[PDB]
Ligand binder design. Structure first.
Ligand SMILES: Cc1ccncc1NC(=O)Cc1cccc(C#N)c1
Ligand SMILES: Cc1ccncc1NC(=O)Cc1cccc(C#N)c1
Lengths: 304, 304
């Protein structure tokens, strides 16, 4: 028992972190096989960031201008290319610690672990979720760009995020490992505002199930609801609409607890309408939405 | 910017996790140099747990009864001894992945990272705090015993906790790496109740400083207080008494923000008396106490 915001063990990703320097800009790179992936804004000066033309800026850069350091040893750059907003630096040495891996582009609501790095060195690991407005609420300072987000399935690391930018509001934006930004953000020092940060309803329901599994049952009520009635309440509270696909994904949690999904939806509806009343659920005074139904099943079963 | 419950990167500790089996009981062990550390209750059957005499139970065990597996290979046990509530299994092979390490016994209020393991395999990493009642609010299932708590200082891993037990209330109890339980708990299947789980005041103040550093300033008031006035309020709310040692440790945060420690104490006092009023601080609707002043400084500066 006990329910914690848990990140995947970071070991497999620590073995891939390198430092990439171009001119006076130093950030993090991800070294898989003989390629180092890093944000393309590594080639920019603070002046260049105002309105960069990356293809033009890249013309003045050669293989030798990209300094890649793994631990205390220098990697030799034998090729460089730009794929969307990431740079792929081909090195002459394959990473001996390359785990089995995939590049995946996740959907909003999906969670992942972040290994926050500075100068190619890991400082911490935390669990995140891709917000419905395609931002992430991370913990990143200057130098953290190139830090990555990932999920692990036994021995295969699915990389889903690479940190690129901090918006004027302090929230974060980044790309998948193909260099495509999540959301409408661009790698430019221009004011870009995020959309509505709505609550991931399916995740809140999954966490309510986790709370029931752990003994926190005070919020369970004598009511039920329909998907349409529930969604009228959810829209009012800036909660994402719940679909039958979400109901399907909650099935194993409904089966384990014997609480029908629509019954848990009715409990959630009363929590939104009445508030917590100074009470807590799993040590939290607000409804947590950064655990997916898969995370709740995984944590409650002990998947390694 | 952004403030997250961050754990240390777990790589260095993943390389130490092994599976220890004795009879029909399988749990986790920590392999440092040529010694495997694990909870001594690995020698017990569920029947033995009711009232175990560990010295007596150990007489019926030999080196060959302890099966230690690291990855998919078996380690040879050439010696075994009991130190307090841990077993130290001397193996014939030194762990090639042994990091620089220390065994430390932490004080209540101090935080650490937990690598939760099952069958010697890591499943997740989360950040914890030793509660003032010497329990931890972890996330552990059957098979997680022997999972460890640690802090890292650049390249040196300070191991501070080893998971042993789940109390009837679902909270957790364990030992330092010398086998001494934190708190008054014993490794026995007997009802043991935890004391008052008070709030770690110094940690809440450190997290209020982190909130100010990140832009959340709504709670900052026009008041100040004294240590004695503050502690009268803190005692009423089951908060730990604040000492001048705690004020000293908050000094770098006070200096960075320009907010005197007693002024932040007065802000905390009004938060306790008035409540949050449906507002949030760093995305939380309650006062977080599992970040030390050192953690806040570390996260806000980017220590790797
Ligand atoms: C200072 C900081 C903190 C946390 N995360 C990231 C940062 N750094 C930045 O945002 C620098 C920057 C400026 C404009 C565009 C991009 C892109 N792509 C990157
Ligand atoms: C089932 C479980 C879940 C999480 N953490 C731990 C556990 N397991 C236990 O507590 C088993 C047990 C029984 C009595 C005494 C001790 C000791 N020392 C250990």
């Amino acid at each position: 028992s006990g329910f914690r915001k848990m990140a995947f063990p970071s070991g497999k990703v620590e073995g891939c972190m390198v430092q990439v320097t171009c001119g006076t800009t130093t950030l993090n790179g991800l070294w898989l096989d003989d390629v180092v992936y890093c944000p393309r804004h590594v080639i920019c000066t603070s002046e260049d960031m105002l309105n960069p033309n990356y293809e033009d800026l890249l013309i003045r850069k050669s293989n030798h201008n990209f300094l890649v350091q793994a631990g205390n040893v220098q990697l030799r750059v034998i090729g460089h290319s730009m794929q969307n907003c990431v740079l792929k630096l081909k090195v002459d040495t394959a990473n001996p610690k390359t785990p089995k891996y995939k590049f995946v582009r996740i959907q909003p609501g999906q969670t992942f672990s972040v290994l926050a790095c500075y100068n190619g060195s890991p400082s911490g690991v935390y669990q995140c979720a891709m917000r419905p407005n395609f931002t992430i609420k991370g913990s990143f300072l200057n130098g953290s760009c190139g830090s990555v987000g990932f999920n692990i399935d036994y021995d295969c690391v699915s990389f889903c995020y690479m940190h690129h930018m901090e918006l004027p509001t302090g929230v974060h934006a980044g790309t998948d490992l193909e260099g495509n930004f999540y959301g409408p953000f661009v790698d430019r020092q221009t004011a870009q505002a995020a959309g509505t940060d709505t609550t991931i309803t399916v995740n809140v329901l999954a966490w309510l199930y986790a709370a029931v599994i752990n003994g926190d049952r005070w919020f369970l009520n004598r009511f039920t609801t329909t998907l349409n009635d529930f969604n009228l309440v959810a829209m009012k509270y800036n909660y994402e609409p719940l679909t039958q696909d979400h109901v399907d994904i909650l099935g194993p949690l409904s089966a384990q607890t014997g609480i029908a999904v629509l019954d848990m939806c009715a409990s959630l509806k009363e929590l939104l309408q009445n508030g917590m009343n100074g009470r807590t659920i799993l040590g939290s005074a607000l409804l947590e939405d950064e655990f997916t139904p898969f995370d709740v099943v995984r944590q409650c079963s002990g998947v390694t």
